[PDB]
């Protein structure tokens, strides 16, 4: 029935990423060892079972700082956060294992499955 | 270079819409005459020049209630808000003029242009 705008979802995500680049309406800092990364909780929830579980919980929804497991690699996390905001996943032989283990921790099954495909094709 | 996830932007927007349906992390009420509609400021900014201009402004960024022009038709606004969260625009002969005038007010040029195409094809 309704008219479908094929580029609209991509346009929305690009503009969310532009807001993240300007720190506009970002509402959380994710701390990963010595690094930290600002984001929108809504985008994190949309992209991660871990962040969904954290922020749906009424005890945690209002947190402004989330400390990740100190074993998580900041580069693997940064790669996945950039994927969340762009639809683009930079998998390479040098980062595949860190990215895949981080995607398991963040509960991102389709990314984990793509990492398995990458390993199988290598 | 990077791996492109074709469904990712659509997945993000669907999950933002699911959060809006549960009123999770919505941060504004838009008042349109006797009706009101909750939303995420980030999605409104991504989809509307009017909301972009309102919430980028440091005097207005923290507002939790925005009163629209009392001449705006609530049904036309609801149609456009649903489009923002779905990529689907329900244009019909009975609503085209209200939708098009509302899209002008919200500063949504590609929607206005699609409304002109609808008129031309009618
Ligand atoms: C150890 N291990 C665990 C897993 C897993 C898992 C399941 N699992 C749960 N949750 C997910 C995802 C994705 C995938 C993204 S991706 N990048 O893979 O395509 C996003 N989310 C959040 C989500 O569904 N959010 C909402 C749902 C309904 N309503 C509102 C919202 Cl916000 C997701 O895989 C993988 N390994
Ligand atoms: C009287 N009259 C005025 C107009 C107009 C206009 C221009 N105009 C300005 N702004 C827009 C749009 C759209 C279109 C959406 S749509 N539905 O038409 O495709 C979205 N936005 C917001 C936006 O660009 N936001 C960001 C930009 C950069 N960085 C971060 C963000 Cl959040 C947009 O058309 C039409 N009639
Ligand atoms: Cl802000
Ligand atoms: Cl909330």
Curated annotation (Swiss-Prot), chains A, B:
Signal peptide: none annotated. Coiled coil: none annotated. Expressed in germinal center T- and B-cells and in primary immature dendritic cells. This is B-cell lymphoma 6 protein. It is found in: Nucleus. Transcriptional repressor mainly required for germinal center (GC) formation and antibody affinity maturation which has different mechanisms of action specific to the lineage and biological functions. Forms complexes with different corepressors and histone deacetylases to repress the transcriptional expression of different subsets of target genes. Represses its target genes by binding directly to the DNA sequence 5'-TTCCTAGAA-3' (BCL6-binding site) or indirectly by repressing the transcriptional activity of transcription factors. Homodimer. Interacts (via BTB domain) with the corepressors BCOR, NCOR1 and SMRT/NCOR2; the interactions are direct. Forms preferably ternary complexes with BCOR and SMRT/NCOR2 on target gene promoters but, on enhancer elements, interacts with SMRT/NCOR2 and HDAC3 to repress proximal gene expression. Interacts with histone deacetylases HDAC2, HDAC5 and HDAC9 (via the catalytic domain). Interacts with ZBTB7 and BCL6B. Interacts with SCF(FBXO11) complex; the interaction is independent of phosphorylation and promotes ubiquitination. It comes from Homo sapiens. It is linked to Chromosomal aberrations involving BCL6 are a cause of B-cell non-Hodgkin lymphomas (B-cell NHL), including diffuse large B-cell lymphoma and follicular lymphoma. Approximately 40% of diffuse large B-cell lymphomas and 5 to 10% of follicular lymphomas are associated with chromosomal translocations that deregulate expression of BCL6 by juxtaposing heterologous promoters to the BCL6 coding domain. Translocation t(3;14)(q27;q32). Translocation t(3;22)(q27;q11) with immunoglobulin gene regions. Translocation t(3;7)(q27;p12) with IKZF1 gene 5'non-coding region. Changing residue 110 to A: Abolishes interaction with NCOR2 and HDAC2, no effect on interaction with CTBP1 and transcriptional autoinhibition. Phosphorylated by ATM in response to genotoxic stress. Phosphorylation induces its degradation by ubiquitin/proteasome pathway. The BTB domain mediates homodimerization. Its dimer interface mediates peptide binding such as to corepressors BCOR and NCOR2. Interaction with corepressors through the BTB domain is needed to facilitate the rapid proliferation and survival of GC B-cells but is not involved in the T(FH) formation and BCL6-mediated suppression of T(H)2 and T(H)17 differentiationrequired for GC formation. Induction: Down-regulated during maturation of dendritic cells by selective stimuli such as bacterial lipopolysaccharides (LPS), CD40LG and zymosan. Protein levels decreases upon genotoxic stress in a dose- and time-dependent way. The gene is BCL6.
């Amino acid at each position: 029935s309704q008219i479908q705008f094929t580029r609209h979802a991509s346009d929305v995500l690009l503009n969310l990423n532009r807001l993240r680049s300007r720190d506009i309406l970002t509402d959380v800092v994710i701390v990963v060892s010595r690094e930290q990364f600002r984001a929108h909780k809504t985008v994190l929830m949309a992209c991660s079972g871990l962040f969904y579980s954290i922020f749906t919980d009424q005890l945690k929804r209002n947190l402004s700082v989330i400390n990740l497991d100190p074993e998580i690699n900041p580069e693997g996390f940064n790669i996945l956060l950039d994927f969340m905001y762009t639809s683009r996943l930079n998998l390479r032989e040098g980062n595949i294992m860190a990215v895949m283990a981080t995607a398991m921790y963040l509960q991102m099954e389709h990314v984990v499955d793509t990492c398995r495909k990458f390993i199988k094709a290598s």
